[PDB]
Amino acid sequence: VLYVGSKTKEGVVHGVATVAEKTKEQVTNVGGAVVTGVTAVAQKTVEGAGSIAAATGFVKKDQ
């Protein structure tokens, strides 16, 4: 019984319940970005960036 660096928990999601009742959902984009409905998401990243729900219209970089 030493428990060195053990029984850890990092980047965990559990026990999620969700109900979504809609009559008319309508997404309409022109030259852009849309992110809708992200749920029950977990991750762990080492030596690097971590992004889960990102949106970007555009990254225009000319000469």
Kindly state the tokens that stand for 59: 């990254």
Q: How far is the CB of 21 from a second copy (least distance, A)?
A: 5
Tell which positions 27-56 bind a second copy, by CB under 8 A.
Answer: 27-56
- DSSP letter at 7 equals S
Q: What is the dihedral of CA 30, 33, 35, 36, to 10 degrees?
A: -20
Q: Which amino acid is at 2?
A: L
Count of residues engaged in binding a second copy, rule: CB under 8 A: 63
Q: Does 14 show up as a binding residue in the annotation?
A: yes
> Which residue numbers belong to the known binding site for Cu cation?
14
Question: Would you tell me which residues interact with a second copy (CB under 8 A)?
Answer: 1-63
Question: Which segments are annotated as binding site?
Answer: 14
